[PDB]
Design a protein around this ligand. Sequence first.
Ligand code: OLC
Ligand code: OLC
Ligand code: OLC
Ligand code: OLC
Ligand code: BGC
Length: 487
Amino acid sequence: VTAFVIMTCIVAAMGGLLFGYDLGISGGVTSMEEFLTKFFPQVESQMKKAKHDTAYCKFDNQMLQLFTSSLYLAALVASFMASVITRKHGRKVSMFIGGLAFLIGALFNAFAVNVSMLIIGRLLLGVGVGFANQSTPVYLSEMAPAKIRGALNIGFQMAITIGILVANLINYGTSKMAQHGWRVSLGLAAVPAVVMVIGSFILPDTPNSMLERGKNEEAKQMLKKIRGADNVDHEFQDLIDAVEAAKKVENPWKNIMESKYRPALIFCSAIPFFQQITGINVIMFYAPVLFKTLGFGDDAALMSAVITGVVNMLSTFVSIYAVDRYGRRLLFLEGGIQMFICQLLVGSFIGARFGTSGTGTLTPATADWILAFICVYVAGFAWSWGPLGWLVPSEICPLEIRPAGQAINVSVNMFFTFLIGQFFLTMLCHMKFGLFYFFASMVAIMTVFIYFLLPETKGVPIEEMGRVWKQHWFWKKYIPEDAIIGG
Ligand SMILES: CCCCCCCC/C=C\CCCCCCCC(=O)OC[C@H](O)CO
Ligand SMILES: CCCCCCCC/C=C\CCCCCCCC(=O)OC[C@H](O)CO
Ligand SMILES: CCCCCCCC/C=C\CCCCCCCC(=O)OC[C@H](O)CO
Ligand SMILES: CCCCCCCC/C=C\CCCCCCCC(=O)OC[C@H](O)CO
Ligand SMILES: OC[C@H]1O[C@@H](O)[C@H](O)[C@@H](O)[C@@H]1O
């Protein structure tokens, strides 16, 4: 562990600011009537004097769903392109492309004069997220010393939560400008993108990719630099062994179906689906919608998003502290149990407060308790399925399929992020609290899935992770001894 590798990983992790900024900025921008008037006049007409309505609830027709979907579709496709570039040219090159596409997208948005420019900008944001999310977790998990890989990789998730929070605060400010507030909100996304582009110039690439691409002496000297030791022979032998196997595989997409990759393939596919079917991106807007329906105004709705965003960010530190000391499993298990219980409590609390009230409207105190329970659910996600959904796929793949497995992770993640968010929009917007019971049942399923099927990965050198699958009661049948590195 050196100061150079920690600074390297902090700078690289700032690639998560891009996706997080976009996740946090969009809600507040859609509620700005100047934005609606310019680009979505059919929505503006529905929102005029609709004191108890929320503008993104109106994005439920085919054309508006197409606009919303375009970011996730571009990200899903760009993720697959990033797998090829990340392997052939390096993790840094994909991080550069991600920052640059996001930067150009932010400018098209901020200076949009018609919806055509908004569509181009949104597609470019999606390209940026696809490249940034595909490549940055690979970068962190290869660069980090094995002992603290969890903590350093989760810097990426921390950056996501920082972007969400910062973006909500920016919308708080730009909502007060006399004019053009939405241009400032969408244009400030360029700031972390410029940081990411310049970072991609100055960062080194990973020794793992340098060696796979034939830069033998550069890779060894780089490993010595990030580990701060003249003798890296044991860990460099891991890289040599990983590249010897990896050089045999010209097309990872045509080999990822082989038995020896099956545990990795299952988890790279299942973890992103499970991460979204927690309901996180639905539940995170339940209280904002509730406060608006109760008459508390746009500012109270945004304030609950800021509160939720602070909890979301600060709770990430629990995973940073515990992930390498106590393990990924403990975090999955506690986080799933805590999320499950909070979903049961909020669902039954809302259901009960209508059968005991008498007046038909929830009180402010009741709304605050609903936000409180939701915040404990968000805290549980924020130290489990949030950070681990960007850590675990990046640390379980052999080198030759590591960019491809992380591309599966991103692309499945984008697909279900949109699908689940759109599918539940009407239930969210009509305050159908039964959704908490559905997501509770999914969280039960994924927690049992983890309990029986996820071997503990903490502290294992990334190229030696086959050792962990080989000792798992179920996955051991897929892993041949000859493929295992180290031991
Ligand atoms: C690798 C690069 C990316 C590859 C993948 C590309 C995905 C393209 C998908 C959709 C874009 C089209 C979105 C069209 C949105 C139309 C919105 C609209 O009509 O808004 C006007 C409104 O209805 C009244 O004012
Ligand atoms: C490699 C590409 C590098 C691109 C780098 C990002 C810059 C592009 C962003 C915004 C447009 C800036 C021009 C400002 C004027 C906008 C008005 C405009 O172009 O209007 C035409 C439009 O078709 C209405 O009909
Ligand atoms: C290392 C850090 C480098 C940081 C580099 C950051 C560059 C982008 C910054 C801001 C863009 C967002 C603000 C754009 C707002 C435009 C709105 C506008 O034009 O309003 C006036 C109106 O047009 C009159 O007619
Ligand atoms: C192997 C994994 C199997 C997992 C299996 C799922 C476990 C239970 C999950 C969610 C609760 C399901 C619904 C519970 C509530 C049903 C009754 C209900 O909704 O009652 C309405 C009433 O008004 C009160 O709000
Ligand atoms: O912090 C919340 C965010 O956590 C990330 O790990 C997820 O991929 C996002 O969908 C989510 O909005």
